[PDB]
Symmetry: C2
Subunit: 181 residues, 2 copies
């Protein structure tokens, strides 16, 4: 039970995607396979722990004091389900995570027992203002349409609506309601 | 692999909840244990298939042609995860489902590896205009705060915002964006 290089899902699944079906604009043109010079687009592994993964998460929102056992426990149950796709971009020649986004598969009974996707926890490093945000969002979206998700949704503040539209997301009429404890 | 009376989760988990911590108004006063005359509040079992479960789902939104094997497959993987809580109200003296709502647990790395809840697929039968909607929403919400979810969210159209507020949900500033395929 110690951090290693085991991924959460089959890496080939990211290189397997129909990148011809990309909606976004890329200049210079990049891909899942070749995401940028120095860069690796892959699944999250437990070793990423050391490599700034929380440094990057900590930009988007609170990450408290995270123990190693709690992170591997969380990861293990995420790997176990097959429903989580935490997807990271590492700057290889630094040993540092520079971007993350999560795909989540919800299983449903409606629309003839369809699956649906949720995009969570999207953050690009302060450092890399390298086209990662586009790359992650277009990759994950396309993965969802291949894991036979009928739809995929996400929540985001107004300022970011425009960003998400380049992937063919649109504003729904439905409000988002929350309650903490 | 045939429909039976096995629940998706431990039924005691619904009767276990801190019903004193209820936010909603009930006249006459009902509970998870005693949900109404004739009624049972419990987990979804695969036998529910026969018992109008889709009749009720079909009110909220499309359910296409659903095979038995696809429903048990979906159910099985939902049971397997521990993260799904499809929760049903059956009118016992009819063999009929009259209400459903789903709790879903998302595992995260943020807020020190917290869990969060999602309320999905809320429908009360055309027949029972018996306090079920309140009962389900207050039960599930309370379950979430006990499965150590730091928060719980849902999406809903404007007309239903007021309904959700009696459970201590509130409008977030975040838009809801969708894309189908």
């Amino acid at each position: 039970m110690k951090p290693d290089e085991t991924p959460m899902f089959d890496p080939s699944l990211l290189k397997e995607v129909d990148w011809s079906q990309n909606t976004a604009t890329f200049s210079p043109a990049i891909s899942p396979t070749h995401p940028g010079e120095g860069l690796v687009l892959r699944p999250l592994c437990t070793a990423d722990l050391n490599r700034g993964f929380f440094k990057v998460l900590g930009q988007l929102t609170e990450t408290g004091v995270v123990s190693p056992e709690q992170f591997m426990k969380s990861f293990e149950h995420m790997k176990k389900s097959g429903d989580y796709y935490v997807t990271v971009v590492e700057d290889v020649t630094l040993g540092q995570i520079v971007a993350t986004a999560t795909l989540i598969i919800e299983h449903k009974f409606i629309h003839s027992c369809a699956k649906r996707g949720r995009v969570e926890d999207v953050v690009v490093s302060d450092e890399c203002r390298k086209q990662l945000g586009k790359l992650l969002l277009s990759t994950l979206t396309l993965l969802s349409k291949k894991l036979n998700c009928y739809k995929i949704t996400l929540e985001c503040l107004p300022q970011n609506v425009g960003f998400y539209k380049k992937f063919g997301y649109t504003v729904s009429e439905e409000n988002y309601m929350c309650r903490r404890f």
